[PDB]
Design a protein around this ligand. Structure first.
Ligand SMILES: [Ca+2]
Ligand SMILES: [Ca+2]
Ligand SMILES: [Ca+2]
Ligand SMILES: [Ca+2]
Lengths: 645, 645
């Protein structure tokens, strides 16, 4: 970093020198007319080279050497240490005419050397290293570098060092004498565009106590920073205001400049500028294979079997159970549909962050606990978080997705069908590290991917399975039981509001239109199976089909005939599975027995959970919801190398 | 690419098979209840494997082999050649119960195999290869791949193959029997977002002649494509509608799908989809080192010396001269300020493309010739193309910029000064391949980088120089001439409207405020010198300083005292340099002689061009403009690897 400083014809030049740079100095312009040669002297801590046509020669502090004056003969000036009060740092040039050895004039350069570095933790260990030479760039991957910012997820003032504890540190390190020379100041600044992406806090007046003031952000694009002599550090705390999105990459920049005062009405000159970049950490979703921490449940207060059975399930684990009831502004599934658990992470810190999309809007929301960051937002059913899932880590065609891939239900491109809102799809895409895939959920009345699919770990391995609803599996099973003489076996036993229908296996198998409707739904399921296999790199060995059955509405879309078992609580080996209420054979539900026969040999332990008995019947709607909060991946997101956007 | 096709319990399944895929087939669901084992037969061109728990075994066309029925025992079906009218492609499965060897039922799969591939020239040689396996991705670099589109720069109808000659080809290649089976169609489509980025043309009815119809673009997101039997190719022509910009990466996608008809009011199912991506080629600027083709000039019709001298200059070269006059809607420099020559290139074709920003707006604009593509657009003087330059190819800190870097004049970030409009800055940035740098032009009244800087090739080498205006150089020269006894030497000789001012070297050197104003301007120049050296990787050996002098206005901004020599016509070794009208010493302009002494030893040939005499004086404004159209770089832009955006 070479900087231009010219000796002034007929005056001394005084300049601040910033360590890490060096000066090239024109001595030729300040030479009086008619002068021929020049010599120079300089102080102990200034290094001076004479550079003639690109060839550099170090010069002593007081020599008598002379050089011909010439536009192509210049000085190179460097200093390796900042000035103190004991410093007189200078270079003096004397000029000579053709005749005689006594100087006819002299021009000089008086220097004050200071160290200025805006430092961040670019090497991502949680401590702010000195002047990381890569701090002005942000690169992905294990060898990648540059500092990370967390969004402030907790929804002109004064803050202590406690309130800012979760933000990122940025330190302005300086070294120099008691004061900057006359006409200089130091200024921290950001662009107008970044002003809604970040905020920066600082103690403006530490003699009055440490009261952190917001100095950069909305409406404040610059802040003059007071210079302290000697070795000094100013500590700033930095927060992100928003996640990456359509139009925002996640990258922001903060600058510090030493500015020189020219004159009134003249802008100040940026003598030196140092830049750090941050990337705001993306919101990341947790798949079913990650260790469960807490199980969240919502239901009506009187659904007693559901609560007892969920509690019994969780007691088999080390998880905590959190019970929530219904609310005026929210659907009956809201803990599943309106709330999504995810996390954010920086080298120094991370925490869980909940996305909230209340049906009727927000009316206070925690009630979820202080441990969570919280982010709240013409909508269709496809906008629900029931329509959002994420796969376990996969590798596809040699490309690794170490954080898994987000799955979103949609309709065929030319179908004119429903689609999750663009703003939410754009958000998920912009987080980049989960590389989302759209599935086809629009053949379902409600239109949620969690109605037809889920993932479970295979106990005692690092592998997993895709679970798919299958109508073909159900028809096969019922046809077998009928052939076995079980055709009169009744479903919905114990649901009094279903009894008059007297639904048996025979009655189901003889309903011709229902058969055709379910062949079609199987085609819809299989279309998904194929996308999942392609985009997750799965084979048929990775998939288990659970029996399901649907009825068709007037839009030709599906709703559950009996509860969808695939939407289940996965806590490692233990699975809470919705109780299907299937046909009773030998006083056991043939659906429950079939599912156990598929899952148990893999060491998966099945517990059927009754969420419908309290309602006396089942019309395709479930009035309860569950959500599991999980430990984040061990893999650090910033070690991923995502495809070029 | 594995696709799910199930045998149907109690019916035959007919399916289209697309080459490049294969089917996995469930035979277990179609088995009657109570059946134990199955066998199979198949035709000559269908390959069938029995896959038991992931282990695959090829099966003969007619064997007697039997396998136990089981959900985990499936078929894998592949075909390597498309069907003809002579084909009967089929797989038949027979089912058996426990007792007896005669089949109790049979299910079968009748196949029609077709080839479908949407092909583009992804390997960038100008010919459309068959099914490039990378055609759905776009990667930069010499080993990079994916197809390139040109914007249509020539500003519900019918077109011949002639009008579309400059667009990109895309070919849908198919192979199959006389017709698709009942209930299938083929559809080309694009997203709504891409609908303003592209257009696609096709002959809908070739029996009526080849009349190309616009089938995809604004308002048309899909087009049903007629299937022809046998080996067939449908030829599409594709055009880009716009350059990359803020919010548009340059990437677009086109899809073709085989859709299956389900039933009325049911959306059609996308059985197979093939995708090609295009990148729209960026607009690229030509630096002064590229070979000149044509020189464009504008002036008033009576500036005779300018025209004669420019003509004489161009006659020393092989370039063409194009003379343009003044227009009601345009400034006097418009060929320089409102017009910018650049080019676009695709593997098959490229041409020059002019950016047009008329002062008062457009009132027909060519008049520049048919050989050029043409693109026309609260503005300040910084928005002028006089404020836009591009460097020769450089390497900086090991990073190559094989196309050079675009340079744009601006003001200091905190200055509240003028800045080129965001839309234009965003455009230049989005082209990506010239990686623009902002300089400081706002200390100039007009505020154009071309007032203070330019580039010239060094004859007989591959190197170049940066030319910088220097007030220090001028003061040095005048002080020498004064010391030499030339203080009364007069400037502006022959300009009658300057005579009464009687400006001499003495009069200039004694004006104290003008000295201080020009020291300041030199600081502005040097601030630029430093940015240029940093961002272009230049040393002091790459720079020559030309003497310049400015006067200051009420805003503290600079205008030329005498014509700025740095803004010059560079045609290889020959430089048209504005005639400065400097002080006469020994009947030669000391400015002209000084400039010759700097440039000539490098083999640069200097010609001074008088653009001001026709006006009788010089107030800082130039009434003529020039622009040089050049050959594009030999380096292909798509071979560059730009930084992640
Ligand atoms: Ca660190
Ligand atoms: Ca969810
Ligand atoms: Ca090709
Ligand atoms: Ca220009």
């Amino acid at each position: 970093r070479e900087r231009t400083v010219r000796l002034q014809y007929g005056s001394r030049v005084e300049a601040v020198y910033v360590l890490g740079t060096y000066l090239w100095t024109d001595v030729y312009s300040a030479a009086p007319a008619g002068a021929q040669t020049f010599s120079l002297k300089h102080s102990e801590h200034v290094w001076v080279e004479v550079v003639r046509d690109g060839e550099a020669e170090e010069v002593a502090t007081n020599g008598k050497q002379r050089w011909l004056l010439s536009p192509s003969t210049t000085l190179r000036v460097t200093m390796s240490q900042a000035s103190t009060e004991a410093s007189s740092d200078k270079v003096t040039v004397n000029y000579y005419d053709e005749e005689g050895s006594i100087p006819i004039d002299q021009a000089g350069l008086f220097l004050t050397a200071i160290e200025i570095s805006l430092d961040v933790d670019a090497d991502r260990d949680g401590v702010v290293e000195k002047n990381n030479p890569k701090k002005a760039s942000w690169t992905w991957g294990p060898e990648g570098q540059g500092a990370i910012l967390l969004v402030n997820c907790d929804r002109e003032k004064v803050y202590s060092k406690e309130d800012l504890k979760d933000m990122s540190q940025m330190i302005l390190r300086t070294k120099g004498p008691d004061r900057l020379p006359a006409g200089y100041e130091i200024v921290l600044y950001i662009s107008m565009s970044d002003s809604d992406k970040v905020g920066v806090f600082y103690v403006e007046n530490p003699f009055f106590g440490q009261r952190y003031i917001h100095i950069l952000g909305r409406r404040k694009l610059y802040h003059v920073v007071k210079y302290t002599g000697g070795s000094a550090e100013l500590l700033f705390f930095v927060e992100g205001l928003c996640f990456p999105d359509e139009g925002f990459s996640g990258l922001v920049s903060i600058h510090v400049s030493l500015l020189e005062y020219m004159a009134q009405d003249i802008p100040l000159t940026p003598i030196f500028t140092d830049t750090v970049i941050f990337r705001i950490a993306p919101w990341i979703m947790t798949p079913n294979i990650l260790p469960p921490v807490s199980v969240f449940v919502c239901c009506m207060k009187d659904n007693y079997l559901f609560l007892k059975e969920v509690k019994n399930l969780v007691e088999k684990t080390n998880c905590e159970l959190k019970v929530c009831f219904q609310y005026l502004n929210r659907g009956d599934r809201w803990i599943q549909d309106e709330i999504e658990f995810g996390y954010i992470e920086a080298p120094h810190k991370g925490f869980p962050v909940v996305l909230d999309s209340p049906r009727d809007g927000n009316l206070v929301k925690e009630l979820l606990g202080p441990d969570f960051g919280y982010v709240t937002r013409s909508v269709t059913s496809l906008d629900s978080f029931g329509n959002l899932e994420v796969s376990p880590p996969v590798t596809v065609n040699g490309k690794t997705y170490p954080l898994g891939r987000i799955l979103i239900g949609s309709s065929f491109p030319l179908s004119g069908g429903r689609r999750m809102t663009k703003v939410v799809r754009d958000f998920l895409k912009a987080q980049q590290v989960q590389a989302p895939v759209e599935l086809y959920s629009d053949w379902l009345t409600v239109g949620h991917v969690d109605e037809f699919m889920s993932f479970v770990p295979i106990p005692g391995t690092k592998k997993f399975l895709l679970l798919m609803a299958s109508t073909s599996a159900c028809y096969k099973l019922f046809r077998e039981k009928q052939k076995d003489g079980h055709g009169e076996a009744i479903m919905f036993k114990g649901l009094g509001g279903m009894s008059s229908k007297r639904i048996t296996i025979n009655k189901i198998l003889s309903n011709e239109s229902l058969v055709q409707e379910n062949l079609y739904f199987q085609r819809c399921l299989d279309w998904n199976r194929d996308i999942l296999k392609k985009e997750l790199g799965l084979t048929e060995q990775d998939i288990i089909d659970l029996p399901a059955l649907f009825k068709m509405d007037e839009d030709h879309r599906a709703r559950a005939f009996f509860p969808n078992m695939v939407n289940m609580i996965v806590l490692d080996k233990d699975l809470g599975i919705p109780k299907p209420f299937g046909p009773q054979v030998e006083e056991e539900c043939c659906l429950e027995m079939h599912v156990r026969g598929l899952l148990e040999p893999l060491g998966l332990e099945c517990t059927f959970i009754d969420d419908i008995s309290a309602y006396h019947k089942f019309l395709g709607e479930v009035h309860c919801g569950t959500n599991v909060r999980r430990k984040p991946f061990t893999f650090k997101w910033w070690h991923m190398v995502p495809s070029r956007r």
